[PDB]
From a paper:
To understand the structural basis for inhibition, we determined the crystal structure of the PrfAWT-1 complex at a resolution of 2.25 Å. The PrfAWT-1 complex was co-crystallized in the space group P21 where the asymmetric unit contains one biological dimer: monomers A and B. Binding of 1 to PrfAWT was confirmed at two sites, AI in monomer A and BII in monomer B, from difference Fourier electron density maps. Site AI is found at the so-called interdomain tunnel in monomer A, situated between the N- and C-terminal domains. Compound 1 binds with high occupancy at site AI, but no ligand bound to the tunnel in monomer B (i.e., to the BI site). At binding site AI the carboxylate is in close proximity with the charged ɛ-amino groups of Lys64 and Lys122, indicating the potential for both electrostatic interactions and a network of hydrogen bonding, which in the case of Lys122 are mediated through the bulk solvent. The naphthyl ring occupies a hydrophobic part of the tunnel bounded by the peptide backbones of Tyr62, Gln146, Ile149, and Leu150, and the cyclopropyl motif is surrounded between the peptide backbone of Gln123 and the phenyl rings of Tyr63, Phe67, and Tyr126, respectively. The second high-occupancy binding site for compound 1, i.e., the BII site, is found at a hydrophobic pocket in the vicinity of the HTH motif in monomer B. The naphthyl group of compound 1 at site BII is sandwiched between the side chains of four phenylalanines: Phe131 and Phe134 from both monomers in the dimer. At this site the naphthyl group of compound 1 sterically prevents restructuring of residues Phe131 and Phe134 into positions needed for formation of an HTH motif compatible with DNA binding (Levy et al., 2008, Schultz et al., 1991).
Residue numbers in the entry:
A (entry chain A), B (entry chain B): 2 to 175, 183 to 237
The structure:
């Protein structure tokens, strides 16, 4: 990822320091009155929300390299009250106060375009995710998440496509319908737990029920989309 | 909105003329290889997708003033295959090719920050609606749709809070489960349909089953929010 490495070197040049985090750590949480811009350089995270009675809802997953913002770039108001939690064993992130960001981007348009693009990818990603929900219900959503996991962590092997993630991360990613659906897929040999990993066979089935996410990845990450097609 | 008028002027300074469109026109369509930046200024539109078997998925609805983009500003490549379709009677929209946009934003960052912040509102908007549907099901959706109508088109009346839309537009966007929900909201007199118009008289019930959208209106459109609170 060329833009990402360039954005790292730009942040470090401007004196911004990389912070290590550990699983279950919160890079920011939903009560913080400091709005941040997080450049997640390495790791896997989830955006969660905590409702008033304390039940946790998982909203979105992110992966390095990527930008996540808790405030609006001009106002430096919260965009929404959320937590960003680390779910891989480690993660590396550059934490930037919102207003510092405005300055950093103002003085370099290339980086500004890059950050802007990361927003565009979230917007196109949620359109595609809503599309596949609209057609195939939860089946759209499970397949969609399995498909991206495969494109991003799948190693072609005679065994199929191995999803290269130690199990703890897979458990952090994953009800009635679910069990019955995840059932159906195992039953149908789309995925297999063999040799202690998931291995994916019917990539075509994933693509069928999550078509828009297939397209979205093709446009967003073409080089990666090519390696399994 | 202030930022909205000023970007309209900047666009006309740089020679972008408003193009008028009428109900059911495609502002752009998915096969068009030209990536665009649509600044919807007035009217209502919807983004749609066309799955292969030909069914038209409604993905999102938009209201002037707002920004819709069909290419990534950095690589200038397609963000997806979409159609942008008018559903109001007429709408005012400035259509800018993606390369010309990038130049316009590059020479005035104020406007760059406005467009950037517009996509940020779009990101958290869809997370908020998703939080509400995951927590409260269709009651969360329905209560979200009506909350939306209320803030944007809610004109306070003795009869309560009227929804100021020609009732063919209403009728353009609007099942078994749905009717059980509206059946109840009509019975408990949270909404009243009289004189062929919707009215709202318990704003606080809606805020209960859609607390993330309510919270989103507050952080992203405080002016609108505060008017009704
Ligand atoms: O990392 C990237 O540049 C690409 C392009 S934008 C994106 C996303 C979208 C949230 C913005 C995701 C999210 C995602 C989807 C499905 C499974 C995931 C598993 C782990 C982490 C994130 C996941 C993933 C992703 O790779 N990308
Ligand atoms: O609001 C819009 O103009 C579109 C059309 S109705 C909708 C929703 C639904 C709650 C009513 C959402 C939220 C949402 C629900 C279910 C699955 C989702 C999957 C991904 C993202 C959001 C999801 C978002 C949204 O944009 N819209």
């Amino acid at each position: 990822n060329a833009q990402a490495e360039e954005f790292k070197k730009y942040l470090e040049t401007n004196g911004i320091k990389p912070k290590q985090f550990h699983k279950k750590e919160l890079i920011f949480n939903q009560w913080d009155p400091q709005e941040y811009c997080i450049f997640l350089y390495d790791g896997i995270t989830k955006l969660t929300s905590i409702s008033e009675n304390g039940t946790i809802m998982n909203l979105q997953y992110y992966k390095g390299a990527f930008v996540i913002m808790s405030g609006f770039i001009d106002t430096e108001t919260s965009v929404g009250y959320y937590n960003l939690e680390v779910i891989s064993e480690q993660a590396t992130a550059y934490v930037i106060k919102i207003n510092e960001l405005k300055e950093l981007l103002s003085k370099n348009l290339t980086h500004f375009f890059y950050v802007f693009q990361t927003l565009q990818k979230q917007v196109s990603y949620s359109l595609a995710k809503f599309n596949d929900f609209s057609i195939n219900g939860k089946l759209g959503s499970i397949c969609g998440q399995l498909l991206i996991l495969t494109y991003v962590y799948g190693k072609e092997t005679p065994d199929g496509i191995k999803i290269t993630l130690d199990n703890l991360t897979m458990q952090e990613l994953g009800s009635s319908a679910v069990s019955r659906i995840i059932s159906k897929l195992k039953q149908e040999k789309v995925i297999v737990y063999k040799n202690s990993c998931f291995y994916v066979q019917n990539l075509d089935y994933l693509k069928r029920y999550a078509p828009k996410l297939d397209e979205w990845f093709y446009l967003a990450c073409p080089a990666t989309w090519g390696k399994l097609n």
